[PDB]
Design a protein around this motif. Sequence first.
Motif, short mmCIF file in Angstrom:
data_model
loop_
_atom_site.label_atom_id
_atom_site.label_comp_id
_atom_site.label_asym_id
_atom_site.label_seq_id
_atom_site.Cartn_x
_atom_site.Cartn_y
_atom_site.Cartn_z
N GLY A 14 0.78 -1.23 0.00
CA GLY A 14 0.00 0.00 0.00
C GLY A 14 0.81 1.28 0.00
O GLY A 14 0.25 2.37 0.14
N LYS A 15 2.13 1.17 -0.18
CA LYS A 15 3.01 2.33 -0.01
C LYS A 15 2.67 3.44 -1.01
O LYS A 15 2.52 4.60 -0.62
N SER A 16 2.57 3.10 -2.29
CA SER A 16 2.32 4.13 -3.29
C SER A 16 0.91 4.69 -3.20
O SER A 16 0.68 5.84 -3.60
N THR A 17 -0.04 3.91 -2.68
CA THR A 17 -1.39 4.43 -2.45
C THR A 17 -1.37 5.51 -1.37
O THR A 17 -2.08 6.52 -1.48
N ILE A 18 -0.57 5.32 -0.32
CA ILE A 18 -0.38 6.37 0.68
C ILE A 18 0.19 7.63 0.03
O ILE A 18 -0.23 8.75 0.34
N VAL A 143 -8.00 6.31 -9.44
CA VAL A 143 -6.55 6.51 -9.41
C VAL A 143 -5.95 5.79 -8.22
O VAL A 143 -4.94 5.08 -8.34
N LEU A 144 -6.57 5.93 -7.04
CA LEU A 144 -6.09 5.26 -5.84
C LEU A 144 -6.06 3.75 -6.01
O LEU A 144 -5.19 3.08 -5.43
N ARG A 145 -6.99 3.19 -6.78
CA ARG A 145 -7.06 1.74 -6.92
C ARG A 145 -6.08 1.19 -7.95
O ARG A 145 -5.92 -0.04 -8.02
N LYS A 149 3.76 -1.58 -10.28
CA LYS A 149 4.93 -1.90 -9.47
C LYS A 149 5.89 -0.72 -9.45
O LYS A 149 6.19 -0.14 -10.49
N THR A 150 6.35 -0.36 -8.26
CA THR A 150 7.29 0.74 -8.10
C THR A 150 8.71 0.23 -8.28
O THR A 150 9.12 -0.72 -7.62
N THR A 151 9.44 0.85 -9.20
CA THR A 151 10.87 0.63 -9.33
C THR A 151 11.55 1.96 -9.11
O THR A 151 11.04 3.01 -9.53
N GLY A 171 10.30 0.55 -4.11
CA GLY A 171 9.68 -0.71 -4.46
C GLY A 171 9.88 -1.75 -3.38
O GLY A 171 10.91 -1.79 -2.70
N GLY A 172 8.87 -2.60 -3.22
CA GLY A 172 8.88 -3.58 -2.14
C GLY A 172 9.12 -5.01 -2.59
O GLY A 172 9.36 -5.89 -1.75
N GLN A 173 9.04 -5.27 -3.89
CA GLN A 173 9.35 -6.60 -4.38
C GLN A 173 10.82 -6.92 -4.12
O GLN A 173 11.65 -6.03 -3.90
N1 LIG Z 1 -8.97 -2.57 -0.87
C1 LIG Z 1 -7.78 -1.99 -0.60
N2 LIG Z 1 -6.86 -1.91 -1.59
C2 LIG Z 1 -5.65 -1.34 -1.37
C3 LIG Z 1 -5.33 -0.82 -0.03
N3 LIG Z 1 -4.08 -0.31 -0.09
C4 LIG Z 1 -3.63 -0.50 -1.37
N4 LIG Z 1 -4.58 -1.10 -2.12
C5 LIG Z 1 -4.46 -1.49 -3.54
O1 LIG Z 1 -3.49 -2.54 -3.61
C6 LIG Z 1 -2.68 -2.40 -4.78
C7 LIG Z 1 -1.22 -2.29 -4.37
O2 LIG Z 1 -1.01 -1.06 -3.68
P1 LIG Z 1 0.39 -0.28 -3.83
O3 LIG Z 1 0.19 1.12 -3.30
O4 LIG Z 1 0.81 -0.25 -5.29
O5 LIG Z 1 1.44 -1.12 -2.96
P2 LIG Z 1 3.03 -0.89 -3.02
O6 LIG Z 1 3.53 -1.07 -1.61
O7 LIG Z 1 3.31 0.50 -3.52
O8 LIG Z 1 3.67 -2.01 -3.98
P3 LIG Z 1 5.16 -1.93 -4.62
O9 LIG Z 1 5.37 -0.50 -5.32
O10 LIG Z 1 6.26 -2.13 -3.46
S1 LIG Z 1 5.30 -3.36 -5.94
C8 LIG Z 1 -3.17 -1.15 -5.49
O11 LIG Z 1 -4.08 -1.54 -6.52
C9 LIG Z 1 -3.93 -0.38 -4.42
O12 LIG Z 1 -5.01 0.38 -4.97
C10 LIG Z 1 -6.38 -0.96 1.00
O13 LIG Z 1 -6.19 -0.55 2.17
N5 LIG Z 1 -7.54 -1.54 0.65
#
Ligand SMILES: Nc1nc2c(ncn2[C@@H]2O[C@H](COP(=O)(O)OP(=O)(O)OP(O)(O)=S)[C@@H](O)[C@H]2O)c(=O)[nH]1
Length: 315
Positions: A14-18, A143-145, A149-151, A171-173
């Motif tokens: 969820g990092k990039s969503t934050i 947009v939030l959804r 993948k973050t590189t 990125g977290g992978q």
């Molecule tokens: N339902 C729901 N979906 C979420 C939540 N947090 C993130 N997501 C969804 O999960 C997916 C991954 O979130 P993302 O923000 O990309 O993780 P990340 O940590 O950045 O992943 P990475 O860049 O290390 S590969 C996205 O489609 C995002 O919309 C949440 O609390 N609830």
Amino acid sequence: REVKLLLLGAGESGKSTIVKQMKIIHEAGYSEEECKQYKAVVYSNTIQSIIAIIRAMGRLKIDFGDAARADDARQLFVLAGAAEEGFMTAELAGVIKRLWKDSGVQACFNRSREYQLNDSAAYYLNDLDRIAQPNYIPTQQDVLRTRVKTTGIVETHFTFKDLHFKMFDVGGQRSEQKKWIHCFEGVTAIIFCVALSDYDLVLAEDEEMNRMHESMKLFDSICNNKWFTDTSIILFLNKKDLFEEKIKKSPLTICYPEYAGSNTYEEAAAYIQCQFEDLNKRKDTKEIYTHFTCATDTKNVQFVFDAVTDVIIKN
Ligand SMILES: Nc1nc2c(ncn2[C@@H]2O[C@H](COP(=O)(O)OP(=O)(O)OP(O)(O)=S)[C@@H](O)[C@H]2O)c(=O)[nH]1
Ligand SMILES: [Mg+2]
């Protein structure tokens, strides 16, 4: 004063969503031109999700509910190229909508922990009529959804409560975890994201490794790293909405065989919190600030980050 925040955690935590929420909450959100940039991502996410399900029916030997869907699935791959370029014809949307409503496809969807499927698969597919319209412009929630993948390192700036925040996202992978060290300088606070609903999933890079156990290993390394002794450790137990639904039907013993509580949100959530906080080797000298979050919920993130900012302010 300048405040450097570092977002860490396993992939898809969820990092990039934050990061996106900080732009929405603290800088007036995404403009129309910006939302339109995500239109291709929404379409790519949608077509990739239905294709992943169709792919899984093959491996799991799940038949379509109606034999007519075999022609729709043929047309799916014929027409898929447009969606991967930001376009959505009325014919492609009809093909996807019929496949999504098929009972065999739905049976495979409900077995998604046996393969790899975007968490937002159902969000977009249940909204196909809205996103398939001509001149569709993604909403803030669309947009939030999105999933990309973050590189590399993403750096964003914003002002809040007279503070100038510099937020760093990596990125977290597993291929990107070796890059985490490049952000280790001058960190005011770490926000470590955990996908609560990962407890019954396995890594895309390894089907033998439990996702939540990998998250625990990363948190163990970060929280106990002497370099971060004076850095505030904030723990986001994220995807609480998906966890609340999953805990009803997927036993937590998949992840923690010794769990003896009920299959309810409060008991299981607290059990996972304690599993992570117990990795802290310095419980008396180092504090962990834990919050349960839904990173896609702007209201929840706003109040949680408000509470986080107070802790940072007070130090
Ligand atoms: N339902 C729901 N979906 C979420 C939540 N947090 C993130 N997501 C969804 O999960 C997916 C991954 O979130 P993302 O923000 O990309 O993780 P990340 O940590 O950045 O992943 P990475 O860049 O290390 S590969 C996205 O489609 C995002 O919309 C949440 O609390 N609830
Ligand atoms: Mg990311």
